[PDB]
Amino acid sequence: MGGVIKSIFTFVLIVEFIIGNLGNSFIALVNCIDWVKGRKISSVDRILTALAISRISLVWLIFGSWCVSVFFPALFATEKMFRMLTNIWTVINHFSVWLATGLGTFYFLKIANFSNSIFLYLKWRVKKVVLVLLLVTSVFLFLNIALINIHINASINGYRRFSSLIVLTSTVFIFIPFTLSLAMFLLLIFSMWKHRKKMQHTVKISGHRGVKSVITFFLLYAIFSLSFFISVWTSERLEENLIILSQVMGMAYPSCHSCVLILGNKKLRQASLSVLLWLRYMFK
Numbered sequence: 001m002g003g004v005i006k007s008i009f010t011f012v013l014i015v016e017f018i019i020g021n022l023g024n025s026f027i028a029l030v031n032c033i034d035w036v037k038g039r040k041i042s043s044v045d046r047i048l049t050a051l052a053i054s055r056i057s058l059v060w061l062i063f064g065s066w067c068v069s070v071f072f073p074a075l076f077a078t079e080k081m082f083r084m085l086t087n088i089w090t091v092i093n094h095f096s097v098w099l100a101t102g103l104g105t106f107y108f109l110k111i112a113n114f115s116n117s118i119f120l121y122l123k124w125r126v127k128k129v130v131l132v133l134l135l136v137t138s139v140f141l142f143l144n145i146a147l148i149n150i151h152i153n154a155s156i157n158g159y160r161r162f163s164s165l166i167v168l169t170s171t172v173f174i175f176i177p178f179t180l181s182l183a184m185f186l187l188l189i190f191s192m193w194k195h196r197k198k199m200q201h202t203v204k205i206s207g208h209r210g211v212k213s214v215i216t217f218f219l220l221y222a223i224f225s226l227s228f229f230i231s232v233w234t235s236e237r238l239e240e241n242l243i244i245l246s247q248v249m250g251m252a253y254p255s256c257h258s259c260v261l262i263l264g265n266k267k268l269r270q271a272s273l274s275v276l277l278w279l280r281y282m283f284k
């Protein structure tokens with residue numbers, strides 16, 4: 001039963017790798033092309049391309065880790081790699097997750113409207129707010145690095161793997177930005193619903209159009225949240241082949257969330273449709 005599970009996990013990891021690579025590469029390439037040929041890019045475009053760069057870095061790191069675990073695994077068994085690779089992974093993943101959270105904050109501030117003066121101040125200071133949020137969050141990165149390093153050092157000292165708790169720490173420190181992003185998304189949905197309710201009563205229908213793209217983000221949130229809920233249960237519930245399971249699980253968000261951005265964004269959606277129609281045309 002182990003062999004079939006391992007093969008299925010490897011295949012799903014391979015498809016995740018290729019899909020994430022192609023999606024993030026498409027995002028970065030279209031943004032760079034539009035930058036080169038005039039087309040003054042927007043702040044959202046800059047954030048999207050930076051996120052794509054971070055995600056391609058993360059997927060390359062994870063795929064290299066998998067290759068090292070497959071080819072000459074003796075190197076992977078070394079403690080030095082166990083420490084260095086996880087440190088670089090946590091740094092890159094923290095930066096990527098908080099960049100995504102910054103994109104969400106930019107959306108929430110730019111689009112949503114409220115009567116609370118604090119919200120108005122953050123709304124009109126949005127550009128400095130997101131940059132400070134990215135800079136101030138570095139304290140979380142340093143604390144995560146210190147905690148993971150001390151935990152692995154203690155585990156090694158006791159030994160002279162114990163990933164059930166390192167993965168727990170990673171999940172705990174990944175839920176922190178995710179909860180804020182979910183709360184902000186719910187707040188924006190509430191704002192849009194209230195705006196449309198108020199618009200449908202006084203103003204006639206002839207006069208919150210983003211609900212069309214809200215459906216896909218809800219699906220992504222649900223799927224990723226279910227996978228993460230399964231993660232904590234599986235970390236202690238059963239089995240011990242967590243290396244491949246964790247290696248595939250940690251690559252879902254940067255591999256699939258990018259496609260959601262592609263469909264949710266008008267520019268990326270138009271680029272995807274143009275690519276599809278160009279593929280059709282060249283076929284002749």
Ligand SMILES: Cc1cc(C(F)(F)F)nc(Nc2ccccc2-c2nnn[nH]2)n1
Pocket residue numbers: 061062063065066081082083085086089163166167170246247249250
């Ligand atoms: C591909 C790879 C290899 C390694 C390792 F080489 F360091 F093992 N780590 C990780 N990062 C994780 C990401 C998500 C969940 C868990 C870990 C995790 N497992 N063990 N340590 N961190 N991803």
Ligand SMILES: Cc1cc(C(F)(F)F)nc(Nc2ccccc2-c2nnn[nH]2)n1
Pocket residue numbers: 100103104105107108181184185188210211212213214217261264265
């Ligand atoms: C591209 C796009 C469009 C829409 C729309 F449906 F409102 F138009 N919504 C989102 N999502 C968010 C919305 C608010 C706050 C944060 C996120 C978020 N968090 N993580 N990723 N995006 N994104």
